[PDB]
Amino acid sequence: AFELPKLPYAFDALEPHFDKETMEIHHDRHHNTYVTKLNAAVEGTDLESKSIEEIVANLDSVPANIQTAVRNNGGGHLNHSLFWELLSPNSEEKGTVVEKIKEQWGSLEEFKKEFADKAAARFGSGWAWLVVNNGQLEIVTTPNQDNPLTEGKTPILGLDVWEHAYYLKYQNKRPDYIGAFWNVVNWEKVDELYNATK
Amino acid sequence: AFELPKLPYAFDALEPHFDKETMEIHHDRHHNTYVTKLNAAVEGTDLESKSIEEIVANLDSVPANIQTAVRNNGGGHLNHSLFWELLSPNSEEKGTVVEKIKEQWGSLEEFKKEFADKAAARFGSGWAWLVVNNGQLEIVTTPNQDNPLTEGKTPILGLDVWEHAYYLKYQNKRPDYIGAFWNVVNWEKVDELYNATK
Ligand SMILES: [Mn+2]
Ligand SMILES: [Mn+2]
């Protein structure tokens, strides 16, 4: 069923912000494992022929016996597939969302400050998200590989704050990693995901 | 009130099992942060002059306004204080508990298998525990910095499977880390904690 998407750039395309060793491991091992376990959980079930977005949006309906496996690895598959596409070696802070951000938060900087506090505050493994909730933009975080789509909020930007995403280059300094992320945001993709809600 | 406990050995004393850079960061930053934040949550209160074990044990009646900070950072302070004392550069597979394990699981290698499978199955950030409950041994894992003492079960052995504990040396290879752990278990301390429940 599901497959591991190829990266849209080289492992080292995001240095010096995200290190090449991490990009390789993160994608080829961690993501891939999410795919393997996800396929095992869904094979033989109604979920097999569903899209990853459809599975995660309707995770509350998934049978109790495979719900955790799908929640965690389906989560994993969706979240990382989004993540790779939301990164870019030549981020431009412009476009539809940067403008909606500017209008809602006053500055792009004010927005980053709020995103960074919430992302740093996520205790344990999780993700920080910019989501649209019924037309309105808001910053939420989730534990582990949970995704706001499960609660009917469309994510348009996400940062992975599992320690495996930053430890090799940043060790404990998660605030420095979040700071480096801004330089590699794929705002074009962010736009594409926002405009898909309209 | 609370203080960062000193390590009973050198930063490099557990090599080649747990690397020295990890031990230093793990102890000086990660554990220290749990201590700083716990101190902020309990200062000027009842809890300040209590022992970390009794705080964590009676977390369920700690007022809802500081519960999360105590749970996370107190739990953090407890779990790591146990962890450092539960490790040794002079590890020796004998004693009261080894014998009980032998009796209950059949062998050490059987008990290790079940411990290693559960430790590897803990999704996200967490700990794997050997606990005394109802005068029997039981393997359980907990999320984040939760400790089975809160659910009335006395832990006697504990393994940190937060990615910070192993990423620098093992990266994604959590099983290899669990494998190395066996070589530095301080079973003299496990005996002491087990015998304290009698
Ligand atoms: Mn990840
Ligand atoms: Mn730890």
Numbering used by the authors:
A (entry chain A), B (entry chain B): 2 to 199
Sentences from the paper on this structure:
This cofactor promiscuity enhances the pathogenicity of S. aureus by enabling it to survive the oxidative burst of the innate immune system while experiencing host-imposed Mn starvation. Each monomer presented the characteristic fold conserved amongst Mn/Fe-SODs, with an α-helical N-terminal domain and a C-terminal α/β domain connected by a loop. The active sites were enclosed between the two domains of each monomer, with both domains contributing ligands. As shown in Fig. 3 and as expected, the Mn ions were coordinated in a distorted trigonal bipyramidal geometry by H81, D167, and H171 in the equatorial plane, and H26 and a water molecule in the axial plane.
The crystal structures of Mn(Mn)SOD and Mn(cam)SOD were determined by molecular replacement, using B. subtilis SodA as a search model, at 2.07 Å and 2.30 Å, respectively (data collection and refinement statistics are provided in Table S1, ESI†). Two molecules were found in the asymmetric unit of both protein crystals. The dimers of MnSOD and camSOD were superimposable in the protein backbone with an average root mean square deviation (RMSD) of 0.744 Å by least squares fit. Superposition of equivalent Cα atoms of chain A and chain B of MnSOD and camSOD gave positional RMSDs of 0.232 Å and 0.229 Å, respectively. For Mn(Mn)SOD, D = –10.60 and E = 0.63 GHz, similar to E. coli Mn(Mn)SOD; for Mn(cam)SOD, D = –10.66 and E = 0.43 GHz, comparable to the R. capsulatus camSOD; and for Mn(Fe)SOD, D = –10.46 and E = 0.33 GHz, which were the same within errors as those previously obtained from simulations of the Ms = –1/2 ↔ +1/2 transition. In the S. aureus Mn(Mn)SOD, the ring plane of H26 relative to the Mn–Oδ1,Asp167 bond was 180°, while in Mn(cam)SOD it was 167°. The 94 GHz ELDOR-NMR and ENDOR of Mn(Mn)SOD and Mn(cam)SOD are remarkably similar, indicating a high-degree of structural homology even at the level of the positions of the protons in proximity to the metal ion, in particular those of the water ligand.
